Design a protein around this ligand. Structure first.
Ligand SMILES: Nc1ncnc2c1ncn2[C@@H]1O[C@H](COP(=O)(O)OP(=O)(O)OP(O)(O)=S)[C@@H](O)[C@H]1O
Ligand SMILES: Nc1ncnc2c1ncn2[C@@H]1O[C@H](COP(=O)(O)OP(=O)(O)OP(O)(O)=S)[C@@H](O)[C@H]1O
Ligand SMILES: [Mg+2]
Ligand SMILES: [Mg+2]
Lengths: 78, 333, 333
DNA sequence: TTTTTT
C-alpha cells in the first residue's frame, strides 16, 4: 500500500509537525495494516489531498478515519 | 420506611418548583399532553410515509436542504398550502428575495392569508420569526435560504471583509432563543438551506450546509431533497423527478427516502404519488408497462395512469383510504 | 509528650469542627462511607467496561457530547431506564424541547414515573435541577443540551444582541451551587452537550463544547459519543454503529472506548454487546463469519448470533454473568 | 467565551 498526504501550504502544520505527523500515521497504519508495507509520505502541496494506492473502497474509508483520528489527536501525539 | 419520606420530599419539591416557575414547570412525562408529537401533511404522500409519523412535527424546527433548483421552496410552499387547507395561518420569511406570488397560488397557497416578510438582515429575519412564534397566531413559518440570513454587521460591512463565524453565532443564538418559543406556541418552523461544497474533502462529503452547526442539532427533521431526473411529456420538460432523503428524524425512523414529481406550475403530483404507492402496495397491478386496477385496465405508462386516476375521483379516494390505512405507521385519526 | 499534645490538639480541633458544622464535617478518609463511589449501569455493557467502575458514578456530574444524531439523547434515556429498573427516580430537564414520549417509552423508560420539565430559561433549567438535587428524592437527572441552556437576559434580549459569555458565567455559577448538593443527595447529574466548531485552529480538534469551561472541570466523567456507521438489514437502515470515548474520568482510567449499536426503537443493543464481549473474552468462537458457542454453531453473522442469544435466555444470562465477572476492572461489592 | 467559510 502507498499513502500520500498532501497538505496545503496556505494551511501549514506547526513547524516540525510534518515529520511527526508522518511517523504518527505510520504507527497507525502498521497497527491497522500489519500485513502490508504501509508507507506514508506527508508533504506540502497546493491542495490537501489523500491518495491511497493498493487498497479497496472500504480500506480507503478506514484510512480516512485513521487520518481523522490522527489529526484530532494531534494534541495527544504532539 | 425511607421510601415514604422520599415520596414526601419528592412531592414537596414538585410543589415548590410548581410555585416557583409555573403550573407546567415539572410533571411526569406520561401526563404531559403538550409533549405529544403532532404532525401535518407535507403535500406529498410518499414523504409522509418516509417521515414515519405522517408529516412534519408541529412545534419543531425543520431543515430542508438541496442543490440549486431542487424544489425546496416548491416543497415548502406545498406544505404551507396543506396547512392552509386545514385552517392554519402561515408566514414566509423570504430572505433570498425571490418568492413568486403567482407560482405560490399555482402550488395552492392562499396568498391573501400568507404573511409575507422580506427581511433586510438575518437578525431582522430571526427577530420577525421570534415575534411570530411568541404571538402564537402563526402555525407554519418558512425561512427561505438561511444563506441569505445576512448578519447586520456583514451588511453594514464591505464585500471582502472577513466576518469570522458571525452568521453561525447568529444562527446558534436564534436557535437558543427560538426552540422554547416554538415549542410553547406549537408553531412549526421550516428552514430552507443551501449546499456549499467545502475545500479539501478528506474526512467527509463536500456537501456542507451553510448557517453553522446549530441548525443540525436543533432541527427535528432534516430533509435532503435533490432533482434526479426530468418529467418530459413529449419533448417538453413539464416536470422534475425529485428524491428526499430524511437524514435526521426525531419523531420517527430516519434514513427513509421518498421519490416524487414536481410538475412545474402544479407542484407535487399527488396522484402520481398515489399511482406508485398503490403499485408497491399490490392494490394497483403493474403488468410490465400496463397499469390495471381490480382487473380494470386503467392505462399504460405512469402519466396515463395518473391522468386516469384524475379522471376517476371515487377510486382515487378509495385507494388513498386503503394506502393511508396500511402504510401510515402512526395514524392520528 | 509532644505527640500526645499533638493528638490532644487534633482531637479538640476535630470535635470543635464537628460541633460547629455538624457530625460529618471532617473525618479520616478511610472511615468516610459517603466518599465511596457508587456506580449505576449505563445500559451498555461495553461502556460499563470502558468506564472502569462499571457505570456512571452516582452523585457526580457527567458530560456526554457529540455530533448531531450521534445518540446522546438515546444513551441518556437508556441510562434513565436502567436506573428506573432499580427502583430509582429520574428526572429529565429538556432544554431542547425535543423529547418524544412514545420513543422514550419504546426504549424501556417508565414514562409515567419519569419527571420531565421543559424549562423556558437556562436559569430556570438549572434552578429546577438544583431543587431536585436538594430534594434528595431524585437519583438521576439528565439535562439535555446545555447549548439550549439560554440565559434569561438572552431570552429577554434580541437576536443579534451580544451576551459575552453569559451562558459560561451562568454555567460556572450553577456548578459552584450544584456540586455540593449533588454530592450530598448522592444524585447523578448527566449533562448532554453539543459540539461546536472553534475557528482559527489549523491543527488538532476544533470541536469545542458549549456551556463554557466549568462543565469540563466539574464533570467526573466526560463521554464523546459518535455515530461511526450504519446498521442495515440489507436495504433499510435499522440502527447506528456508535463509539463512546471516555475523554475524562475521575473514577477510573480514562481514554478507554466502547463500541455498540443503537437499534431504532430498541435502544442500545444489549444482546449484540453481549455477543461481542463474549467474543473478546474467548467465550464466543468466530470462524470467519460463523459464530459458535461451545461447539454448537449458534449463528452466521452478528444478527443471527444475536437472535440465537435472544431465543436462549438461560445461555444469555450465563454469558452475561461470566462477562461481568471477567471484564469489570472494579468488581463492586 | 463565542462561532465557520468556500
Ligand atoms: N414560477 C414558476 N413557474 C413554473 N415553474 C417554476 C416556477 N418557479 C420555479 N419553477 C420550477 O420548479 C422547480 C423547483 O422549484 P423551486 O421553488 O425553484 O426550487 P428551489 O430549489 O427552491 O430553487 P431555488 O430556491 O431557486 S435554489 C424548478 O425546476 C423550477 O424551475
Ligand atoms: N422517535 C424516534 N424514532 C425513531 N428513531 C429515533 C427517534 N429518535 C431518535 N431516533 C434515532 O436514534 C438515533 C440516536 O438519536 P438521538 O439519540 O435522539 O440523537 P442525539 O445524539 O441526541 O442527537 P440529537 O439530540 O438528535 S442533535 C438516531 O439515529 C435517531 O434518528
Ligand atoms: Mg427558492
Ligand atoms: Mg437529543
Amino acid at each position: 500500500m502507498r499513502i500520500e498526504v498532501t497538505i496545503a501550504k496556505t494551511s501549514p502544520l506547526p513547524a516540525g509537525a510534518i515529520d511527526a505527523l508522518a511517523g504518527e500515521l505510520s504507527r497507525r497504519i502498521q497497527y491497522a495494516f500489519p500485513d502490508n508495507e504501509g508507507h506514508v509520505s506527508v508533504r506540502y502541496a497546493a491542495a490537501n489531498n489523500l491518495s491511497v494506492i493498493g487498497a479497496t473502497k472500504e480500506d480507503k474509508q478506514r484510512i480516512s478515519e485513521i487520518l481523522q483520528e490522527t489529526w484530532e489527536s494531534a494534541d495527544d501525539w504532539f | 420506611a425511607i421510601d415514604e419520606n422520599k415520596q414526601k420530599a419528592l412531592a414537596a419539591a414538585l410543589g415548590q418548583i410548581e410555585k416557583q416557575f409555573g403550573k407546567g414547570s415539572i410533571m411526569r412525562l406520561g401526563e404531559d399532553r403538550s409533549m405529544d408529537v403532532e404532525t401535518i401533511s407535507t403535500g406529498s404522500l410518499s414523504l409522509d410515509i418516509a417521515l414515519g409519523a405522517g408529516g412534519l412535527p408541529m412545534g419543531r424546527i425543520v431543515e430542508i436542504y438541496g442543490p440549486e433548483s431542487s424544489g425546496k421552496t416548491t416543497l415548502t410552499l406545498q406544505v404551507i398550502a396543506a396547512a392552509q387547507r386545514e385552517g392554519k395561518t402561515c408566514a414566509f420569511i423570504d430572505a433570498e428575495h425571490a418568492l413568486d406570488p403567482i407560482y405560490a397560488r399555482k402550488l395552492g397557497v392562499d396568498i391573501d392569508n400568507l404573511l409575507c416578510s422580506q427581511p433586510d438582515t438575518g437578525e431582522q429575519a430571526l427577530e420577525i420569526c421570534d415575534a411570530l412564534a411568541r404571538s402564537g397566531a402563526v402555525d407554519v413559518i418558512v425561512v427561505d435560504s438561511v444563506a441569505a440570513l445576512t448578519p447586520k454587521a456583514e451588511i453594514e460591512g464591505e464585500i471582502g471583509d472577513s466576518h469570522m463565524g458571525l452568521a453561525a453565532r447568529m444562527m446558534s443564538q436564534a436557535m437558543r432563543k427560538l426552540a422554547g418559543n416554538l415549542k410553547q406556541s406549537n408553531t412549526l418552523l421550516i428552514f430552507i438551506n443551501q449546499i456549499r461544497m467545502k475545500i479539501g474533502v478528506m474526512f467527509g462529503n463536500p456537501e456542507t450546509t451553510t448557517g453553522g452547526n446549530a441548525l443540525k442539532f436543533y432541527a427535528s427533521v432534516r430533509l435532503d431533497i435533490r432533482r434526479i431526473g426530468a418529467v418530459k411529456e413529449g419533448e417538453n420538460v413539464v416536470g422534475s423527478e425529485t428524491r428526499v432523503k430524511v437524514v435526521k428524524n426525531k419523531i420517527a425512523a430516519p434514513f427513509k427516502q421518498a421519490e416524487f414529481q414536481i410538475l412545474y406550475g402544479e407542484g407535487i403530483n399527488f396522484y402520481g404519488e398515489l399511482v406508485d404507492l398503490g403499485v408497491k402496495e399490490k392494490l394497483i397491478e403493474k403488468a410490465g408497462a400496463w397499469y390495471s386496477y381490480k382487473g380494470e385496465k386503467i392505462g399504460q405508462g405512469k402519466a396515463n395512469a395518473t391522468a386516469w386516476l384524475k379522471d376517476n375521483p371515487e377510486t382515487a379516494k378509495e385507494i388513498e383510504k386503503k394506502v393511508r390505512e396500511l402504510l401510515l405507521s402512526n395514524p392520528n385519526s
